[PDB]
């Protein structure tokens, strides 16, 4: 899998202003907000820092495997690109795999991951390789000890039509919600360097697993 191209997207920006309410295409004919601030744990640990820090670990491990990588953003302290631009950046790289990282803000009772993929598919890639990617990633996250969400999606998977990053993708692309920041157990993982590394190692498996099918 050495030499393959992976686009990594740590969801959200390190900082925001009024410009995130700017309307950008959804990829399905409508518009949505350029960005969203994202959620956080009860103690104030932000989604945007979690995805940034976890993405860095993911990036490092893939780099060590000889995999080519690029980030949707390069910091956690300034404005980042809108959600359509992050898809366009990826498309320009014609990647073998695209992975977006997020963390949920759901009912405290719920915990665990779910993998989002574009549905119904807008192209052959979204209909095939991306679904295969989502399934492989789900199995690898599970085999690594990350529990599947029991409160959202079904069986750790979720067909979405509302995500611009997924809708606009022309290359294998999934968006992983790693867990629920509002859940005490999930947040304990997220707020820890050790937990973020576990998340990252699991992600590497899912990515490497899918890249190996190319
Ligand atoms: Zn913040
Ligand atoms: Zn998010």
Of the chain, the end-to-end C-alpha distance in Å amounts to 8
Q: What is the CATH number of the domain that holds 100?
A: 3.40.630.40
Å from CA of 116 to ligand 2 middle: 12
Closest ligand to C-alpha of residue 49 is 1
DSSP state of 162: S
Q: How many C-beta neighbours within 10 Å does residue 95 have?
A: 23
- DSSP characters for 81-148? --HHHHHHHHHHT--SEEEEEEEE---TT--SBEEEEESS-SSHHHHTHHHHHHHHHHHHHHHTTPPB
- Residue whose C-alpha is closest to residue 210's, from 177, 174, 180: 174
Resolution (A): 2.1
| Residue 102 annotated as part of some ligand binding site | yes
Closest ligand to C-alpha of residue 39 is 2
Q: How many C-beta neighbours within 10 Å does residue 123 have?
A: 12
Å from CA of 1 to ligand 2 middle: 29
Å from CA of 140 to ligand 1 middle: 30
Catalytic option among 85, 177, 191, 194? 177
Its domain, for residue 34, covers 1-214
Closest ligand to C-alpha of residue 47 is 2
- Residue whose C-alpha is closest to residue 68's, from 93, 86, 101: 93
Å from CA of 78 to ligand 1 middle: 10
Domain count, the chain: 1
Phi, psi of 170 (to 5 degrees): -115, 5
Token pair, residue 99, equals 């992975």
Q: 193 near 50, Cβ under 8 Å?
A: no
- Residue whose C-alpha is closest to residue 9's, from 175, 122, 125, 152: 175
Based on the residue annotation, tell me whether 177 is a catalytic residue of this protein. yes
Q: How many C-beta neighbours within 10 Å does residue 57 have?
A: 18
- HSE-CB of 66 using CA atoms within 13 angstroms: 5
Q: DSSP 3-state assignment of 8?
A: strand
CA distance 16 to 14: 7
Phi, psi of 25 (to 5 degrees): -65, 150
| Residue 12 annotated as part of some ligand binding site | yes
């Amino acid at each position: 899998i050495a030499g393959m191209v992976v686009f990594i997207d740590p969801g959200h920006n390190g900082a925001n202003d009024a410009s995130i309410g700017r309307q950008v295409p959804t990829g399905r004919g409508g518009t949505k907000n350029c960005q969203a601030s994202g959620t956080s744990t009860n103690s104030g640990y932000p989604e945007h820092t979690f995805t940034w820090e976890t993405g860095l670990r993911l990036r490092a491990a893939l780099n060590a495997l000889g995999v080519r990588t690029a980030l949707s953003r390069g910091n956690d302290n300034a404005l980042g690109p809108c959600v359509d631009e992050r898809a366009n950046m990826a498309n320009a790289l014609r990647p073998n795999a695209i992975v977006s990282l997020h963390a949920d803000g759901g009912p405290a009772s719920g915990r665990g991951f779910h993998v989002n993929y574009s549905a119904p598919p807008l192209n052959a890639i979204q209909a095939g390789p991306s679904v295969q990617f989502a399934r492989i990633m789900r199995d690898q996250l599970q085999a690594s000890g990350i529990p599947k969400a029991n409160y959202i999606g079904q069986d750790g998977l979720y067909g979405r039509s509302d995500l611009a990053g997924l809708n606009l993708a022309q290359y294998p692309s999934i968006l992983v919600e790693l867990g629920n920041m509002k859940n005490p157990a999930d947040s304990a993982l997220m707020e820890s360097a050790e937990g973020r590394q576990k998340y990252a190692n699991a992600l590497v498996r899912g990515v490497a697993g899918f890249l190996a099918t190319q």
